[PDB]
Amino acid sequence: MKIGIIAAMPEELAYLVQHLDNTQEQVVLGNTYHTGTIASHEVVLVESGIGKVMSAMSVAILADHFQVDALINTGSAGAVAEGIAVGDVVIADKLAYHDVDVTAFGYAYGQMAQQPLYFESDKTFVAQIQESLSQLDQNWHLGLIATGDSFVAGNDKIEAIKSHFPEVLAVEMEGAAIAQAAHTLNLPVLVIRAMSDNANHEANIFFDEFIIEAGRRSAQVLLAFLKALD
Template identity: 35%
Template sequence: MKIIIGAMFEELEVIINSRKLIPVLNSVFQEFKTEDNKLVVCVSGIGTVNASACLSYLLTKYNHVEQIINIGTSGAICTSLKQGDVVIVDKASYPTTNVTSFGYQHGQVPKMPVYFESDKNLIDQRINKFKQMNQEFKIVNAATMDVFVDNKSIVDNVIGRLPFNAQIVEMEIAAYMQVAHLFNIPFVGVKIISDLVASDHKSTLEFDDFLPQAAKKINDLV
């Protein structure tokens, strides 16, 4: 079984409708699956707690999960990315987590890795597939925080303290990665850049206007 998980229904709507996925009744979350149960698509809701609760729920509910794929949108905090770019997430951490007084790295959860990572084999699979599709992409790192980043001060003084350079910011992927790490299930994240945050460069479209385009592109990638 494969699990595709994302924060918003609007991001996954085209995947769900185009594949005629069946709603799962009595689920705690918005959950859809194929008749053969080989694919589950689930909407976790926005934020780290929703993300971790949803994926933990799914991994407790289903056996034989082979891989987890997070698909969705994210904001870019570097000038090398633009609206509509496809990115594969390598590393992610929580920039608002600070236990450095006890010897941990900035963003590191106590007794957890310094940062969380996508599975290298799944990254390689996506790279090969995107190359076959002639789909341009970039490998990036993510800062996950329950804060809407709208000024450069947060980027410089909070996100900038992470032990790696983060190119995107969003609100779920590190939480998904942490749960996948705890359950020892291969994970990979693929994102569409929806907007440029805390930057003088402006997105071509506002987020709500761009979201339908992103959903279609997500479906094409899947």
């Protein structure tokens, strides 16, 4: 298959570009799309930019211009579940928006109009990625990642998000957006994020400090996954 891989920032795509075989770069609508293969898998890498709109646009272009068959997001996120450490990797089995309120019409909190409440990562992708990781390794996690067009940096917002999604493991700004776009195109999706901060008052500082490492760790897990996907 042909996999479209999206990262919000350059720090989150660098490692993958460095491991891209038969690399070629195409400029489309002012952005660079890296084509080639990874572990014999045809892929297209792109730095979308931050947020729902930018990531959604990248999905649309990957589908319309490159005819991708699947979508995978890699990058950083803020750790919110107790016990998750900076540097840990969270594989999203499900994604949802923590900043969406269309409840006046009867939708569940977080559920966008005309959309399901939860977007699910491809069951086959999730099954296989777990198989590539060790059960003895306690630094990777499988669970819910909540998305919003905000950088979470305070216990108050963390608590507010948890009141709606108590099982949330991490938070970011593109996960559910890419999953929503993928769902709209009937394309399988997977989201992988490494923790760059604790989404608290010190989040901006930790993010600045750990974005390079988080971007690399998330990408390393993706690379290991792709090599085992076959």
